[PDB]
Write a protein that binds this ligand. Sequence first.
Ligand SMILES: Nc1ncnc2c1ncn2[C@@H]1O[C@H](CSCC[C@H](N)C(=O)O)[C@@H](O)[C@H]1O
Ligand SMILES: Nc1ncnc2c1ncn2[C@@H]1O[C@H](CSCC[C@H](N)C(=O)O)[C@@H](O)[C@H]1O
Ligand code: NA
Ligand SMILES: [Sr+2]
Ligand SMILES: [Sr+2]
Ligand SMILES: [Sr+2]
Ligand SMILES: [Sr+2]
Ligand SMILES: [Sr+2]
Lengths: 217, 218
Amino acid sequence: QPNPPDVDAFLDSTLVGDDPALAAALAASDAAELPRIAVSAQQGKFLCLLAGAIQARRVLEIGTLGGFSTIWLARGAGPQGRVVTLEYQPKHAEVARVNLQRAGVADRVEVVVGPALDTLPTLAGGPFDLVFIDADKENNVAYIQWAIRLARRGAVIVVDNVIRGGGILAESDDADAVAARRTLQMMGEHPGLDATAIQTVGRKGWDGFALALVREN
Amino acid sequence: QQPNPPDVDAFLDSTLVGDDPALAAALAASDAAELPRIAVSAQQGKFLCLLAGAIQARRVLEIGTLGGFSTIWLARGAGPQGRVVTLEYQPKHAEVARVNLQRAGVADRVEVVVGPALDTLPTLAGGPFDLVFIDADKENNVAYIQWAIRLARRGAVIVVDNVIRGGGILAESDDADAVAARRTLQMMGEHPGLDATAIQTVGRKGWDGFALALVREN
Ligand SMILES: Nc1ncnc2c1ncn2[C@@H]1O[C@H](CSCC[C@H](N)C(=O)O)[C@@H](O)[C@H]1O
Ligand SMILES: Nc1ncnc2c1ncn2[C@@H]1O[C@H](CSCC[C@H](N)C(=O)O)[C@@H](O)[C@H]1O
Ligand code: NA
Ligand SMILES: [Sr+2]
Ligand SMILES: [Sr+2]
Ligand SMILES: [Sr+2]
Ligand SMILES: [Sr+2]
Ligand SMILES: [Sr+2]
């Protein structure tokens, strides 16, 4: 009788609690008619704790939407950390900037507007400690190649949505399952990466993520 | 037949891990000694390895060794200068694990400490620990987490295995590991020294999940 969404509601109440900044971000995202595809609270808290564990101070995110995952990354990187997040849609970037300011992390985050393949070669500063790749899935492999080039040795790369209900193994007419399957094959074969993939369930259904360490950059 | 999580894990194993004769030998030795086949899956073990590597862990504490499968992955992630202390109360499990760690080339990084963890944890001087993996008798998760906080550095990572148990944490069944998991999660959420999340997983081992926490303060 218990199902993964019910368990996630319990985990949210038990481990995350009331989050008025993310509640406001959801309402603002809804008012702007953004798709409800942001990370769940357990998933966002995972990104936050991952950034905190490695003491990430330079974080790259590809795919901002309304800034939900971005807020979590900025929380984990802390007041000394900086997050650069890339977003193709001007309307998404504008909502995210408002959501970031209301969550109190605007001093830590820059939203860079444009196709990520055009903005990544000009991104400056220093090498990244953590890269979260969550944009157009057909460019996952290009984004991972960029992540390796722009990350420090030992940086963490996280790729969202790599399982898609098992569609990566099924003759499924799902462009992003095709992309996710090729992404996993590329990560396994790449000599500069050491990677794992964890299948997940919860409020967003059966999916999963890839996590890799940059061996050489 | 549509793909299921075990099928997907087999693909992930073949694609991201590949042939691993050290872990193949560890499984075979564990089977030969009739250990329960309840080790972490390869994707789960690799996650522990990459987590230790990501935080550059040099002192790792594991509670619940079995045949050393999770231990091998932790030792791989800690590197040649890293050290793992792993606690096991069954002498036969400890003996199998020591053989498996040697064949995995990590015996010089790992100490298996034999005895009930509640009795050996106060004798440990191998800290402060950077990473604690809690995977032993579930009714003592909460005690082991309290010890982990005491023995860890600030900012250390604590991972607790098997905290979902097929959704049983929401049921009122006389189910020891689900009752313990629910209490474990409630304790972690309430502890002012911990910041925690829990991820539900599927795969070879079915619907389960893990808790991950940062030690915010000793
Ligand atoms: N080529 C591209 N470059 C940058 N962003 C892109 C892109 N293609 C799609 N996107 C953006 O990627 C986002 C994916 S949804 C991202 C969700 C977010 N990470 C969260 O969990 O809260 C969308 O906002 C979409 O506009
Ligand atoms: N009180 C206790 N102290 C130390 N070890 C204990 C214990 N109670 C149970 N155990 C041990 O905990 C182990 C749980 S199975 C551990 C599996 C292992 N972590 C892997 O993934 O490969 C068993 O070997 C069991 O004997
Ligand atoms: Na690889
Ligand atoms: Sr996503
Ligand atoms: Sr079609
Ligand atoms: Sr276990
Ligand atoms: Sr009983
Ligand atoms: Sr049970």
